[PDB]
Design a protein around this nucleic acid. Sequence first.
RNA 1: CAGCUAGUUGGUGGGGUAACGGCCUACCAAGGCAAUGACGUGUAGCUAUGCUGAGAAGUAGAAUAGCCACAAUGGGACUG
RNA 2: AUUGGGCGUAAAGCAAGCGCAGGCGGAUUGAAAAGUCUGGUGUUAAAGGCAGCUGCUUAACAGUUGUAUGCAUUGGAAAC
RNA 3: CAAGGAUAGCACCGGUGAUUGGAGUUAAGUCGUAACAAGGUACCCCUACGAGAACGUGGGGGUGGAUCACC
RNA 4: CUGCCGAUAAGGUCUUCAAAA
Lengths: 135, 204, 155, 141
Amino acid sequence: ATIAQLIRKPRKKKKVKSKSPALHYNLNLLNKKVTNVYSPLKRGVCTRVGTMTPKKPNSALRKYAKVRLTNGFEVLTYIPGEGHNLQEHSVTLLRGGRVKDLPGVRYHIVRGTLDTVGVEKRRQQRSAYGAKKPK
Amino acid sequence: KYTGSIFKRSRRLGFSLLENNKEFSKGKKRKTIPGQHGNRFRSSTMSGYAQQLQEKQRMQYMYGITDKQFRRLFRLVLKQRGNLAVNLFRVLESRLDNIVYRMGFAPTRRSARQLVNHGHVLLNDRTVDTPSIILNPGDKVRLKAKTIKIPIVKAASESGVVSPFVETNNKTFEGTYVRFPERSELPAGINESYVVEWYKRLVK
Amino acid sequence: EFEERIVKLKRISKTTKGGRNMRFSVLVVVGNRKGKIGYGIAKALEVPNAIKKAIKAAHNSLHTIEIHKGSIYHEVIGRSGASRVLLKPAPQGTGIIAGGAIRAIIELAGYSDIYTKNLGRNTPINMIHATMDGILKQLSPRRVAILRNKNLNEL
Amino acid sequence: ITTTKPIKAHFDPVADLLTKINNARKAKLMTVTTIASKLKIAILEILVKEGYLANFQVLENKSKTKRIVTFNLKYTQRRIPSINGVKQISKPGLRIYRPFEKLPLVLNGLGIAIISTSDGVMTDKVARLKKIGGEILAYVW
RNA sequence: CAGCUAGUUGGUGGGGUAACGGCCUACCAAGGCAAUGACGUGUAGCUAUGCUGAGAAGUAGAAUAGCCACAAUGGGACUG
RNA sequence: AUUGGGCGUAAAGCAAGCGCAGGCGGAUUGAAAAGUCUGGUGUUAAAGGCAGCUGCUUAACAGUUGUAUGCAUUGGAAAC
RNA sequence: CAAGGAUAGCACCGGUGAUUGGAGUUAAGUCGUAACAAGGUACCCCUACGAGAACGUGGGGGUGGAUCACC
RNA sequence: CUGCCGAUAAGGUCUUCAAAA
Ligand SMILES: [Mg+2]
Ligand SMILES: [Mg+2]
Ligand SMILES: [Mg+2]
Ligand SMILES: [Mg+2]
Ligand SMILES: [Mg+2]
Ligand SMILES: [Mg+2]
Ligand SMILES: [Mg+2]
Ligand SMILES: [Mg+2]
Ligand SMILES: [Mg+2]
Ligand SMILES: [Mg+2]
Ligand SMILES: [Mg+2]
Ligand SMILES: [Mg+2]
Ligand SMILES: [Mg+2]
Ligand SMILES: [Mg+2]
Ligand SMILES: [Mg+2]
Ligand SMILES: [Mg+2]
Ligand SMILES: [Mg+2]
Ligand SMILES: [Mg+2]
Ligand SMILES: [Mg+2]
Ligand SMILES: [Mg+2]
Ligand SMILES: [Mg+2]
Ligand SMILES: [Mg+2]
Ligand SMILES: [Mg+2]
Ligand SMILES: [Mg+2]
């Protein structure tokens, strides 16, 4: 605009928001305060398994899950794989992501880590799904 | 740490290790890209990225280098004075294992690496244990001794076929070298200068 | 040896009473790598005929380019529509640091060392247009001598 | 020398002249007039020594209260000017003060930069020679 | 987040502090700061520097190094 | 988007005016020297940054010498 | 002199809450057909009232309106 | 010369390519 105008009211930068907000909240429990500390991936416990329908082009039945994380945020997380051992009550170790078919899902469950089983009958891209090398 | 199928990568690009031993072979005289999908159309018009990466592999497969080593050497040579297009060619050709094969004391380049790794070589006044030392023209890289009697010295002692940039001085095995290699001794297998700009994008 | 390199192959189409008339358009840059370069854009039902006509048009319009020590003498901004391309002198050794349409024009002209930046749009026609306007407005240090009544550029 | 028209000028003395030269170049006009100030006279004197304009004459009234400079541009035989583009540095508001180390070189010395350090307006080359810098009025190339 | 500040502003004599000082005291006054952002809220140890950027600068204040602050929480003092 | 963007039809000219503080501002002369420019001195801890070299089989790394930035003071320049 | 304790009323901030308001997102739900052509009553802006709903009408304002036309 | 005149389930192809003769 003009030098005089910018000296009075400087240039305020637009902000930046994350894509996986629920993974950066830590509850201390001893004081019951939530701080914003970034963490790559977080552990949670599922509450409700089921199916959802993709947006428009896609047509299928995708398995979602309502997992409550160590914090106090409830997020619907897609189970990336063919077949699950979730039994409404289980523990899962969520990661980042964003499935485009289901609106609202922005997290993925890391497969084959804790209570959740690996994805057997897979020889391609195993390192991501978690299957022991056939050897 | 290297590939065990040098024929496959040499046959695709088209250029061998400069004697065509891996291209002539004893069978089928194959000059097609390997795999079932070798005899197809859509041959030319590789994008600049495509041809640069294929060519970049050619340079770093001719000498047995890992790309990370390449980034290190490029970062070293890049900053100095100016258009250093005469230095990095000498630097890339200054590898100790490269000079020993060009010394004429090994049947193949990577076989020379094994002899280097096994300690059968001495530098000017010290020994060699790592096949990555950067040499400078003037060092009497005298050959070892306990290796002149091994059942493989025959082709090794036939160094009469040698490039002019190395004054091997056989028998006495003085093993010196000078007169840095011109582009003539670096044949058209890899002769280009826009790989520097490719690494300029990838390496600061 | 006027080499030629396709810089873009778009797929334009009009609509008729049922169906879509589809014709390919090519943007070829022809250059002798000594100071002569032209551009030609042509449309045809098939790629071969389009390429022939585009090269013919490009060869019909060849401009003259001056090089100083292999690089560009002075910084210049080429403007064409909403595309603005910045050209900068470079020391002998950097190489062509250009990319895309700008890189093709500079290589085909003869220039070696060159700093470039597309400050505007990413439409190939405007990038080539901007590069050529910037290169054509360049002033030699002898034309200004006739103008300034100096001593052949001498301080 | 007589005129018939009123002579006006802008309050900013560098860009006033800059508009006159650029408009005259753009409109193919040759002779223009404006009111005279010592800075504008000085920038025009170094300008005519470097050869961008042909003549530059400042005039005064018969009462000694007003002075107006009427300058003409140096066109070649084919009627294309010698000036190509003008751009001002020490804009109003933001005064440009540069030491010697950041003294600009316009088009690798092809153009001239006007710098009034301590002895009136002064060219970039002689500023480098004296190794002293200061106010930079405008870029002319 | 538009008023805030009553030892807050100043003088006097005295006391106290390694030292100057409303640091403290008795008296005399009503000032001081504030739209060029006081005050309030939220946040945070600061810096040399680390990563990034052609540059202007953006970003974190790893390690280590300077300064400050703290030693379960909140106060007081001895020795020196 | 200071360097480095825009506001007719794409986001963006307040419905218009009187207007204090702020920003900008005709020509000439004199002085001062606050900006501006320059010389000398002090300082800007060390490590890190960049250059050269040495030492580890070369490197990574370590050491080594060089390498600015700003502030204050003093002496001049007088074009804005 | 004074940490702390008890009593007392203001100030700021957070969580939760029966019930309720709208909002977004959703392959193939129901009632109309308001807008894009003169969209079949030209459209749009402000405003007041009214109606299942899009919206209708009154007042002012615009062409970012079609047709029309002139030798 | 101005009656009346409302609606139309979802997702979808089709350009393979100029290296050249
Ligand atoms: Mg029809
Ligand atoms: Mg007092
Ligand atoms: Mg940048
Ligand atoms: Mg630290
Ligand atoms: Mg720490
Ligand atoms: Mg914009
Ligand atoms: Mg608008
Ligand atoms: Mg208006
Ligand atoms: Mg308006
Ligand atoms: Mg007025
Ligand atoms: Mg005023
Ligand atoms: Mg004035
Ligand atoms: Mg230091
Ligand atoms: Mg070190
Ligand atoms: Mg219906
Ligand atoms: Mg309708
Ligand atoms: Mg109707
Ligand atoms: Mg209607
Ligand atoms: Mg009803
Ligand atoms: Mg009604
Ligand atoms: Mg109405
Ligand atoms: Mg109306
Ligand atoms: Mg009106
Ligand atoms: Mg009817």
